């Protein structure tokens, strides 16, 4: 109770002006010039800063606080999504590791590097469920599965915050985006979200609850409407659910201009009413638009808000700073009153980035064991992503320096050394569409546009392929194609690069596709025509080295998809945990399309190996399960091939008769197992009542007696099943 007494005694001494100042979250920029901001900090008008990311800059801002009456320290936040300076694979690629220890390592190193630069908080993890591949922000989440995303949500929060939020190598997690942000209609960023309460509670909300239960200090509120109500004005979401049902005791933070955006949503006619709706809904901290500082005094004096609205918000800010240790030592992450190079090579974590990046790479095709490659012969390395440092570190690359990143080309060159001969040709620009190139280059030069014609680049690539034994085509999206507000109407590799691929195929040379992308892609032609396909997402600062490690067989690919790959954008959404319908497709009068093959091209949990694995028959510990008892599902996994390697044994559950139509299967467990040739492991899954419960039409959360079907396999599509009955 030291914390409650400290905050009560401080707040008893604060003016409303001082309490309102604590709610203000700003960045140095056009709207807040540095010297005016310094003056506001000295006056106690600023609660926190984002987007200031070096120790001397952060220390300088904290120094201004000694001029305010109460000297309440700032906290400093940043978007450390998948690395701070050492960039790990994007989250969608981290998820493909199926290894909470790998994901925890990326988060722990991110927090170590961020805190070493003086940051206290990250706007991460992003834990929104994504079933729509068009949305640019699918790169930031962990895929489509509620169970896996919820597990990794808690893993990220614990890895960031550690055993103690006051530790100088801990940062506070601000879990985002609360809530349902990835259900945007049409996959258009910021668009309308409309869903039933059972779907919301069963499928979309659990990853946010998992973050709260892992002790997340902060929640960042989403930009979207939920069933007509913007999250930023949603008292049900932020008060009734988050605080009163889930027991969240931390800090709610608006997104950038989100309070002011209530006017565009048509919830408010003016900034005064927008401010009232946000503070009364339960938004504590106001990012950038300064509406709280502008309007809260007038709102209170007019009796339009209560003192308790200000006091709740201010208490939450002070409680976060308290937990971060900033009242004990506001410089605990900023060292003592020797300068250093923030971007020194010595401050990076290349070993960790390379080991983590290996685990997320997904082998999608490997005809006649073309991979792994031998380090010999003439290897053509062709495509616009082969030499791209900007793209390998992905979207939301924080303080990542492209020039420090290892490209696919450089990774191959490092791997072969003097062996083999690499032949480079760019082959195509990332896009043939000038309006797309101008969008991607609209703010910063993100995409190198080769001034040569497409035809000249193609002729050069064909000459290179002719001079080679095999072709490694490095193709896909630029990182700006899978970013905030970068929604796509087409899930294929860009047309300029597909023209290149078809030309390379026509040479007859063995064709290896290395894909870079931040979302599921439509790969029908590639699955038919490529000899091998390696999904590399955006693999980060050591991406090229991790990719070469897999291509030459130093690492046996072990990644498995956490999001279904649709055959085309016209099939969206496709996800493994769908309902059966009354007329399931297995034949015209079924739930299907007629103009394309049905189901995903690659299902949830899919990924190949350089070795072969066998599963023994699934055995359940009983055919009947008593209430409050545990069931064991056992299988033996064996490495039946010639190479050491890992795979992921997946356990799915179906409730085939229920008060609601339940999914054809739902992930309830998994085990990643590394085996030498001829090794076995007995895998034991534990199932309890908590695994069997679901939200019905009235949101009763219970398990109904009846049959459950247990499936075990190496992907969602290739399983063996046994049933038991819950009594």
Residues noted as catalytic: 255
Query: Binder to its own copies among 16, 27, 54, 192 (CB under 8 A)?
Result: 192
Q: With binding defined as CB under 8 A, does residue 199 bind its own copies?
A: yes
Q: With binding defined as CB under 5 A, does residue 727 bind Mg ion?
A: no
Query: Binder to its own copies among 588, 627, 628, 682 (CB under 8 A)?
Result: 588
3-state secondary structure of 186: helix
DSSP states along 69-82: SS-PPPEEEE--SS
Are 726 and 704 within 8 A, CB to CB? yes
Q: With binding defined as CB under 8 A, does residue 177 bind its own copies?
A: no
Site residues (CB under 8 A) for its own copies, limited to 389-428: none
Give the whole-angstrom CA distance, residue 554 versus residue 573: 36
Neighbours of 616 (CB within 10 A): 15
Q: With binding defined as CB under 8 A, does residue 441 bind its own copies?
A: no
Given Mg ion, its own copies, none, residue 589, with its beta carbon under 5 to 8 Å by kind, binds its own copies
Q: With binding defined as CB under 8 A, does residue 707 bind its own copies?
A: yes
Choices 147-155, 368-376, 627-635, 660-668; region in contact with its own copies by CB under 8 A: 660-668
Smallest gap from residue 655 Cβ to Mg ion (A): 4
Choices 514-522, 539-547, 637-645, 698-706; region in contact with Mg ion by CB under 5 A: 698-706
Site residues (CB under 5 A) for Mg ion, limited to 628-667: 655, 657-658
Q: With binding defined as CB under 8 A, does residue 599 bind its own copies?
A: no
Q: With binding defined as CB under 8 A, does residue 442 bind its own copies?
A: yes
Nearer to its own copies, 92 or 481 (CB): 481
Give the whole-angstrom CA distance, residue 158 versus residue 122: 13
Choices 4-12, 225-233, 416-424, 603-611; region in contact with its own copies by CB under 8 A: 225-233
Residue 128 is assigned to a ligand binding site: no
Residue 610: closest CA among 529, 560, 551, 671: 551
Give the whole-angstrom CA distance, residue 108 versus residue 106: 6
Are 278 and 233 within 8 A, CB to CB? yes
With a CB cutoff of 8 Å and minimum separation 6, the contacts of 233 are 262, 265, 267, 268, 274, 277, 278, 281
List the alpha helices (DSSP H) in 223-287: 235, 271-281
Smallest gap from residue 545 Cβ to Mg ion (A): 49
Residue 61: closest CA among 313, 70, 51: 51
Q: With binding defined as CB under 8 A, does residue 264 bind its own copies?
A: yes
Residue 655 is assigned to a ligand binding site: yes
Q: With binding defined as CB under 8 A, does residue 693 bind its own copies?
A: no
Given its own copies, Mg ion, none, residue 704, with its beta carbon under 5 to 8 Å by kind, binds Mg ion
Smallest gap from residue 214 Cβ to its own copies (A): 28
Q: With binding defined as CB under 8 A, does residue 268 bind its own copies?
A: yes
Supply 17's token pair: 């002006």
Nearer to its own copies, 9 or 442 (CB): 442
Smallest gap from residue 68 Cβ to its own copies (A): 33
The dihedrals phi and psi of 162, each to the nearest 5 degrees, come to 65, -160
Q: With binding defined as CB under 8 A, does residue 195 bind its own copies?
A: yes
Smallest gap from residue 599 Cβ to its own copies (A): 11
End-to-end Cα distance, the chain: 45
Query: Binder to its own copies among 342, 616, 659, 680 (CB under 8 A)?
Result: 659
Nearer to its own copies, 613 or 708 (CB): 708
Are 517 and 497 within 8 A, CB to CB? no
Q: With binding defined as CB under 5 A, does residue 162 bind Mg ion?
A: no
Nearer to Mg ion, 402 or 706 (CB): 706
Are 365 and 608 within 8 A, CB to CB? yes
Q: With binding defined as CB under 8 A, does residue 580 bind its own copies?
A: yes
Query: Binder to its own copies among 4, 306, 329, 490 (CB under 8 A)?
Result: 490
Give the whole-angstrom CA distance, residue 114 versus residue 295: 34
Smallest gap from residue 703 Cβ to its own copies (A): 15
Residue 283: closest CA among 226, 230, 362, 358: 230
The dihedrals phi and psi of 436, each to the nearest 5 degrees, come to -70, -45
In the sheet that 218-221 helps form, which strands lie side by side, from edge to edge?
251-253, 218-221, 172-178, 121-122, 75-78, 48-50, 24-26, 286-287
How many Å separate Cα 153 from the centre of its chain?
Answer: 9
Smallest gap from residue 242 Cβ to its own copies (A): 16
Across the strands, what pairs with 726?
625, 706
Choices 86-94, 165-173, 345-353, 431-439; region in contact with its own copies by CB under 8 A: 431-439
Q: What is the largest CA-CA distance in the chain?
A: 80
Smallest gap from residue 704 Cβ to Mg ion (A): 5
Q: With binding defined as CB under 8 A, does residue 582 bind its own copies?
A: yes
Are 377 and 416 within 8 A, CB to CB? no
Nearer to its own copies, 385 or 415 (CB): 385
Q: With binding defined as CB under 8 A, does residue 198 bind its own copies?
A: yes
Give the whole-angstrom CA distance, residue 564 versus residue 398: 28
Choices 200-208, 337-345, 671-679, 703-711; region in contact with Mg ion by CB under 5 A: 703-711
Smallest gap from residue 431 Cβ to its own copies (A): 8
Give the whole-angstrom CA distance, residue 271 versus residue 289: 10
Choices 51-59, 66-74, 489-497, 670-678; region in contact with its own copies by CB under 8 A: 489-497
Annotated binding site: 655, 657
Binding site members for Mg(2+)? 655, 657
Q: Which residues contact Mg ion by CB under 5 A?
A: 655, 657-658, 704, 706
């Amino acid at each position: 109770t030291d914390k409650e007494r400290f905050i009560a005694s401080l707040m008893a001494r604060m003016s409303n002006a001082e309490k309102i100042g604590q709610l203000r979250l700003v960045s140095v920029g056009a709207d807040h010039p540095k010297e005016a901001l310094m003056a506001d900090i000295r006056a106690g008008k600023v609660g926190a800063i984002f987007n200031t990311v070096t120790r001397p800059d952060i220390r300088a801002m904290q120094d201004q606080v000694r001029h305010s009456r109460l000297k309440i320290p700032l906290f400093h936040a940043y978007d450390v999504a998948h690395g701070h300076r050492t960039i790990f694979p994007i989250s969608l690629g981290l998820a493909a590791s199926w290894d909470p220890e790998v994901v925890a390592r990326s988060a722990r190193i991110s927090a170590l590097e961020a805190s070493a630069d003086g940051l206290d908080m990250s706007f991460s993890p992003m834990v929104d469920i994504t079933r729509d591949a068009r949305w640019g922000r699918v790169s930031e989440g962990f895929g489509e599965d509620t169970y896996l995303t919820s597990l990794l949500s808690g893993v990220m929060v614990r890895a960031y915050q550690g055993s103690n939020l006051a530790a100088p190598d801990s940062i506070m997690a601000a879990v985002k985006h609360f809530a349902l942000y990835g259900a945007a209609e049409g996959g258009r960023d910021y668009n309308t979200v409309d869903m039933s309460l059972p779907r919301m509670f069963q499928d979309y909300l659990p990853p946010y609850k998992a973050a709260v239960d892992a002790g997340a200090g902060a929640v960042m509120v989403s930009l979207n409407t939920i069933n007509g109500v913007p999250a930023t004005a949603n008292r049900w979401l932020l008060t009734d659910l988050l605080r009163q049902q889930w027991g969240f005791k931390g800090l709610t933070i608006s997104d950038h201009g989100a309070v002011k955006e209530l006017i565009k949503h048509g919830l408010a006619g003016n900034e005064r009413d927008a401010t009232r709706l946000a503070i009364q809904a339960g938004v504590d901290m106001n990012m950038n638009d300064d509406l709280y500082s502008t309007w809260l005094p007038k709102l209170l004096a007019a009796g339009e808000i209560d003192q308790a609205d200000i006091d709740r918000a201010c208490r939450d800010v002070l409680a976060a700073k308290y937990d971060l240790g900033l009242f004990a030592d506001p410089y605990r992450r900023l060292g003592k009153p020797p300068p250093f190079d923030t971007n020194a090579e010595s401050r990076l974590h290349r070993q960790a980035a390379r080991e983590v990046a290996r685990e997320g790479l997904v082998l999608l095709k490997n005809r006649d064991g073309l991979l792994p490659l031998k380090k010999q012969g003439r290897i053509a390395v062709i495509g616009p992503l082969a030499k791209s440092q900007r793209d390998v570190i992905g979207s939301w690359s924080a303080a990542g320096v492209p020039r420090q990143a290892v490209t696919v080309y450089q990774g191959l060159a490092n791997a072969v050394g003097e062996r083999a001969t690499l032949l480079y040709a760019k082959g195509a620009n990332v896009s043939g569409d000038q309006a797309i190139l101008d969008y991607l280059n609209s703010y910063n030069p993100e995409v190198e546009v080769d001034p040569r014609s497409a035809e000249a680049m193609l002729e050069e690539a064909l000459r290179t392929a002719r001079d080679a034994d095999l072709v490694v085509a490095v193709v896909g999206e630029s990182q700006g194609m899978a970013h905030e507000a970068s929604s796509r109407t087409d899930l294929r590799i860009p047309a300029s690069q597909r023209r290149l691929l078809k030309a390379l195929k026509a040479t007859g040379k063995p064709l290896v596709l290395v894909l870079m992308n931040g979302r599921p892609l439509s790969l029908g032609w590639e699955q038919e025509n490529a000899d091998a396909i390696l999904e590399t997402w955006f693999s980060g600062t050591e991406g090229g080295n991790a990719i070469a490690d897999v291509l030459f067989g130093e690492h046996n690919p072990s990644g498995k998809l956490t999001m279904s790959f649709p055959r085309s954008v016209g099939q969206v959404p496709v996800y493994y945990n769908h309902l059966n319908t009354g007329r399931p497709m297995d034949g015209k009068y079924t739930s299907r399309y007629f103009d394309e093959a049905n189901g995903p091209l690659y299902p949830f949990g899919y990924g190949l190996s350089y070795t072969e694995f066998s599963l023994s028959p699934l055995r359940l510990s009983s055919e009947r399960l008593a209430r409050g008892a545990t069931l064991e599902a056992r299988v033996t996994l064996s490495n039946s091939g010639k190479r050491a390697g890992a795979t992921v044994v997946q356990l799915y559950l179906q409730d085939p008769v229920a008060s609601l139509s339940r999914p054809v299967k739902e992930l309830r467990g998994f085990r990643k197992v590394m085996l030498e040739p001829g090794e076995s492991r007995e895998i034991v899954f534990r199932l309890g009542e908590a695994d069997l419960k679901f939200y019905d039409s009235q949101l009763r959360h219970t398990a109904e007696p009846g049959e459950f079907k247990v499936f075990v396999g190496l992907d969602s599509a290739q399983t063996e099943s046994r049933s038991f009955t819950l009594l």
